[PDB]
Amino acid sequence: FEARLVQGSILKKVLEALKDLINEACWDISSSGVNLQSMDSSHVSLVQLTLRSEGFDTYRCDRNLAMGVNLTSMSKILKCAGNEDIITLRAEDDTLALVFEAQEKVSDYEMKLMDLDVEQLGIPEQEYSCVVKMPSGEFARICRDLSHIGDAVVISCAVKFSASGELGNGNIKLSQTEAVTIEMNEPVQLTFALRYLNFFTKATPLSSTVTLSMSADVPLVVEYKIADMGHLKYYLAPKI
Amino acid sequence: MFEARLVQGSILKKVLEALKDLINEACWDISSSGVNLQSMDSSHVSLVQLTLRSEGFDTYRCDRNLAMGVNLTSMSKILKCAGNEDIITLRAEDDTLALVFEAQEKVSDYEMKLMDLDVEQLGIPEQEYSCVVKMPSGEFARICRDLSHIGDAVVISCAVKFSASGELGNGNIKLSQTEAVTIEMNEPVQLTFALRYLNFFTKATPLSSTVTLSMSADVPLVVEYKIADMGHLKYYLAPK
Amino acid sequence: MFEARLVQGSILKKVLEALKDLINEACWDISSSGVNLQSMDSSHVSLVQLTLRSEGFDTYRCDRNLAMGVNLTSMSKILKCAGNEDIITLRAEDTLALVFEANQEKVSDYEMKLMDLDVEQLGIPEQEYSCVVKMPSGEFARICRDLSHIGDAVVISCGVKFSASGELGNGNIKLSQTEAVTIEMNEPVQLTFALRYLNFFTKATPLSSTVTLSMSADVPLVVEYKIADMGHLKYYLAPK
Numbered sequence: 001f002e003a004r005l006v007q008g009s010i011l012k013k014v015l016e017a018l019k020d021l022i023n024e025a026c027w028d029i030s031s032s033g034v035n036l037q038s039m040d041s042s043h044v045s046l047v048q049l050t051l052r053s054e055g056f057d058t059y060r061c062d063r064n065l066a067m068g069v070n071l072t073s074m075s076k077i078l079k080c081a082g083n084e085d086i087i088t089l090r091a092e093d094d095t096l097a098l099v100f101e102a103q104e105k106v107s108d109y110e111m112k113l114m115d116l117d118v119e120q121l122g123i124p125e126q127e128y129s130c131v132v133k134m135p136s137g138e139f140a141r142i143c144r145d146l147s148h149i150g151d152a153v154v155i156s157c158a159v160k161f162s163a164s165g166e167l168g169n170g171n172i173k174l175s176q177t178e179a180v181t182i183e184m185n186e187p188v189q190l191t192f193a194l195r196y197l198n199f200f201t202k203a204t205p206l207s208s209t210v211t212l213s214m215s216a217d218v219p220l221v222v223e224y225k226i227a228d229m230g231h232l233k234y235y236l237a238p239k240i
Numbered sequence: 241m242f243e244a245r246l247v248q249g250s251i252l253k254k255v256l257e258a259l260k261d262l263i264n265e266a267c268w269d270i271s272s273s274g275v276n277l278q279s280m281d282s283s284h285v286s287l288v289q290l291t292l293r294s295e296g297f298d299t300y301r302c303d304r305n306l307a308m309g310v311n312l313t314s315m316s317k318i319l320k321c322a323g324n325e326d327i328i329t330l331r332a333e334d335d336t337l338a339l340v341f342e343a344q345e346k347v348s349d350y351e352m353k354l355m356d357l358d359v360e361q362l363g364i365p366e367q368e369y370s371c372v373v374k375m376p377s378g379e380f381a382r383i384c385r386d387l388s389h390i391g392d393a394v395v396i397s398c399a400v401k402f403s404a405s406g407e408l409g410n411g412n413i414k415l416s417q418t419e420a421v422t423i424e425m426n427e428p429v430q431l432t433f434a435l436r437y438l439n440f441f442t443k444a445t446p447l448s449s450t451v452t453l454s455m456s457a458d459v460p461l462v463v464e465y466k467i468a469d470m471g472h473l474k475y476y477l478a479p480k
Numbered sequence: 481m482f483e484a485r486l487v488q489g490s491i492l493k494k495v496l497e498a499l500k501d502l503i504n505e506a507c508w509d510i511s512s513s514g515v516n517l518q519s520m521d522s523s524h525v526s527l528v529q530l531t532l533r534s535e536g537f538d539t540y541r542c543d544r545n546l547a548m549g550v551n552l553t554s555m556s557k558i559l560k561c562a563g564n565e566d567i568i569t570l571r572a573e574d575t576l577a578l579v580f581e582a583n584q585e586k587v588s589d590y591e592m593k594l595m596d597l598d599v600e601q602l603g604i605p606e607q608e609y610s611c612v613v614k615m616p617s618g619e620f621a622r623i624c625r626d627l628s629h630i631g632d633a634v635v636i637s638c639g640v641k642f643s644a645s646g647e648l649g650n651g652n653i654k655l656s657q658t659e660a661v662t663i664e665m666n667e668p669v670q671l672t673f674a675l676r677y678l679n680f681f682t683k684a685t686p687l688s689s690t691v692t693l694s695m696s697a698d699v700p701l702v703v704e705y706k707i708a709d710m711g712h713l714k715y716y717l718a719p720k
């Protein structure tokens with residue numbers, strides 16, 4: 001296995017987008033590309049990462065890795081790369097290696113791996129009654145702001161975000177028009193932990209838009225396109 | 241119904257930031273002439289007095305007169321959910337206060353519970369000051385911050401000199417009459433102030449480029465920031 | 481009486497900012513030739529040497545030779561009250577006087593207590609080194625910062641390579657000859673150094689865009705930042 005990613009900035013932001021939510025994950029390296037699946041230690045949320053082999057320059061993959069990366073350690077290592085370095089990931093077939101370029105400085109770190117083995121669930125495309133596409137910056141400020149009002153945001157479509165706390169309560173209305181796009185089939189209303197929404201927004205540097213997909217029968221989806229390569233999907237169950 | 245609309249709502253942002261590290265609560269006197277606040281810090285050595293005239297709002301409504309008990313900690317948290325460009329509107333009926341932030345298709349409505357904090361305002365007349373100094377606000381801020389790294393107290397004197405003395409050594413800053421610097425000085429005067437409260441005061445620096453210091457051995461010092469077109473923030477502090 | 485006036489007073493700001501975290505005190509050697517400082521950290525594993533020549537000052541008056549014992553923690557704290565554009569004057573008849581001149585709008589006078597600290601400087605002669613690396617200061621700071629999250633110690637070797645090993649894994653950074661990188665290698669050396677002191681040394685990075693590492697196996701590591709027109713800051717550090 002070896003994958004050379006010009007524009008390692010992506011790999012950097014990916015790790016930044018994961019490390020606050022989960023401490024380790026099985027990286028499932030494959031011929032189709034890098035795909036990751038993991039839940040936070042409370043099992044309220046699931047993140048799925050997809051970097052497809054076409055978005056990497058080079059890319060090669062003899063066998064199927066079930067790499068157990070310590071996501072803390074990987075993010076630490078990944079902070080030693082400048083935003084412009086060319087990151088490469090080589091892993092033979094129990095420790096992963098990483099390489100940063102430029103072209104005058106060049107750095108080789110090598111990360112001890114870990115024995116994580118849980119298989120991946122098969123997660124298919126559900127049907128959502130309300131689907132919202134909006135600027136990701138806007139969405140991050142809404143979760144940041146409301147989280148100084150209360151612990152939980154109520155999301156509604158007819159789209160409105162509401163939080164209720166000790167000092168009072170607030171709500172932000174957003175209307176269809178970066179653009180804001182609402183796709184309803186049915187009115188929908190669910191409450192979520194702002195704690196985890198504020199983890200999810202750490203992916204904001206990966207895309208200017210975000211997409212929210214709500215239904216009463218499935219977890220919320222919060223997804224960031226890693227353009228020309230894949231996506232970061234966050235799944236979040238509601239509160240009861 | 242009271243309802244005030246302020247297009248330049250960052251003023252409100254700045255006013256709460258100028259109050260919150262000094263006082264936790266306050267009675268906002270709402271009348272048809274505008275908003276008037278006066279409140280003292282928990283240790284009774286300083287008084288701050290805010291004036292926002294109705295004509296200085298873009299829109300003013302005040303059917304009945306109000307005395308709003310406000311948790312300034314709560315109100316400041318709310319007001320940080322507003323962007324610096326948001327148009328802010330305050331509204332209340334004849335028990336809670338409503339705030340509205342207008343971005344142009346995002347619109348936020350927060351609701352704050354009031355409290356029973358009613359204390360009739362004192363009449364504070366104009367006094368006569370042995371020395372009166374008009375300086376750039378930022379310089380006043382820098383001086384107080386500098387000297388507080390030297391000692392706990394500042395000695396101010398005119399003929400203007402700011403002096404501090406501590407375990408480290410001593411220091412003093414001389415400003416000369418000429419933003420401009422202006423010393424109406426009908427009298428030499430030298431007094432001593434707690435830099436802790438001055439440094440609270442300078443949190444109103446954003447509200448104006450200039451600050452006016454009025455001193456006299458017979459009356460509290462007055463630190464005054466004009467809120468252009470709308471009123472002032474006046475901080476009164478007792479010496480020794 | 482001693483009186484050195486520096487129009488680029490920011491040089492004093494950066495110099496003190498570069499010493500404060502390594503040493504808390506030092507004897508300053510004031511003579512007609514200028515300012516000479518030689519101090520060791522309390523662990524006695526590193527030595528810092530400061531040269532500021534008289535011709536590098538705007539005025540330099542030395543009526544009598546001095547050995548000022550200075551509390552470097554006090555003098556840093558005072559120098560933070562200087563603005564980076566200020567003219568800074570040090571003066572000593574006991575006590576040390578610092579004058580900050582803003583031109584001139586504000587004029588600041590600070591006074592510091594001296595202390596009894598007088599060791600005699602020692603003759604460090606121009607040693608001969610096996611490898612001399614001149615590079616961007618900022619890059620050297622980044623390498624040391626980066627590697628210090630991997631391990632406690634960096635292994636430097638002469639191309640030139642920085643290595644560090646720890647609980648996470650391992651890392652190598654290689655800079656080839658090419659601000660420029662020039663490696664003047666006389667025989668390959670390989671010494672291990674505590675990253676904790678190298679990160680102290682790099683606090684001087686604002687004084688020069690270029691740093692110079694010099695290594696032999698028989699002598700301490702030398703890390704030199706020139707102070708344009710005045711002299712240098714030499715950090716010296718023993719291996720393991």
Ligand SMILES: O=C(O)CC[C@H](NC(=O)c1cccc2ccccc12)C(=O)Nc1ccccc1Oc1ccccc1
Nearest residue numbers: 263265266267278279280281282284287357359361362
């Ligand atoms: O607004 C708030 O923060 C809550 C209420 C608060 N009260 C005290 O601080 C306080 C409590 C108990 C004894 C005192 C004795 C001396 C000074 C202050 C106090 C306050 O500010 N009063 C106040 C606000 C504005 C003008 C004057 C104020 O007090 C008065 C009232 C009457 C005559 C002297 C002073």
Ligand SMILES: O=C(O)CC[C@H](NC(=O)c1cccc2ccccc12)C(=O)Nc1ccccc1Oc1ccccc1
Nearest residue numbers: 280283284285286287362363364460461475476477478
């Ligand atoms: O040691 C302690 O706790 C007392 C602290 C002290 N005394 C009083 O406030 C006080 C005690 C008893 C009756 C009053 C009647 C009227 C006014 C004040 C008092 C003090 O510093 N005030 C103060 C400090 C700074 C700016 C103004 C101040 O007063 C005010 C407050 C409001 C409007 C006019 C003046």
Ligand SMILES: O=C(O)CC[C@H](NC(=O)c1cccc2ccccc12)C(=O)Nc1ccccc1Oc1ccccc1
Nearest residue numbers: 285364365367456457458459460461476477478479480
């Ligand atoms: O002895 C005399 O009658 C006159 C001189 C004396 N001044 C002070 O005590 C004094 C000096 C310096 C700073 C302070 C800070 C806080 C409180 C008092 C002082 C006095 O009583 N003032 C006075 C008399 C009657 C009504 C209020 C008074 O104070 C004021 C006036 C304005 C606003 C706050 C308080």
Ligand SMILES: O=C(O)CC[C@H](NC(=O)c1cccc2ccccc12)C(=O)Nc1ccccc1Oc1ccccc1
Nearest residue numbers: 503505506507518519520521522524597599600601602
């Ligand atoms: O200036 C300050 O910060 C305090 C004074 C300080 N002394 C020590 O560190 C220190 C104290 C006690 C035993 C030691 C034993 C070994 C190494 C250091 C010390 C200092 O810098 N000495 C110094 C400054 C410059 C050139 C040499 C220095 O030491 C000497 C002196 C003579 C021969 C070897 C070394």
Ligand SMILES: O=C(O)CC[C@H](NC(=O)c1cccc2ccccc12)C(=O)Nc1ccccc1Oc1ccccc1
Nearest residue numbers: 520523524525526527528602603604700701716717718
């Ligand atoms: O205490 C421990 O075990 C380590 C302390 C150690 N030794 C001495 O300073 C020492 C011990 C006994 C006699 C001396 C005679 C002359 C000079 C030094 C010594 C050390 O590391 N110095 C050092 C580390 C880094 C850069 C320079 C160093 O020395 C200096 C200091 C001043 C000028 C020249 C070189």
Ligand SMILES: O=C(O)CC[C@H](NC(=O)c1cccc2ccccc12)C(=O)Nc1ccccc1Oc1ccccc1
Nearest residue numbers: 525604605607696697698699700701716717718719720
């Ligand atoms: O390897 C052999 O056997 C011969 C060479 C040997 N080197 C060291 O001790 C040594 C190696 C590496 C770092 C240090 C750091 C601090 C102190 C000593 C060392 C030696 O005697 N030097 C020496 C002889 C006489 C006076 C001082 C000496 O050190 C120096 C020399 C220059 C400036 C500081 C100290």
Ligand SMILES: [Cl-]
Nearest residue numbers: 022023024041
């Ligand atoms: Cl975990």
Ligand SMILES: [Cl-]
Nearest residue numbers: 225229230231
């Ligand atoms: Cl996709």
Ligand SMILES: [Cl-]
Nearest residue numbers: 263264265282
């Ligand atoms: Cl209070």
Ligand SMILES: [Cl-]
Nearest residue numbers: 291470471472
């Ligand atoms: Cl006014």
Ligand SMILES: [Cl-]
Nearest residue numbers: 503504505522
């Ligand atoms: Cl020390």
Ligand SMILES: [Cl-]
Nearest residue numbers: 531710711712
């Ligand atoms: Cl030199």
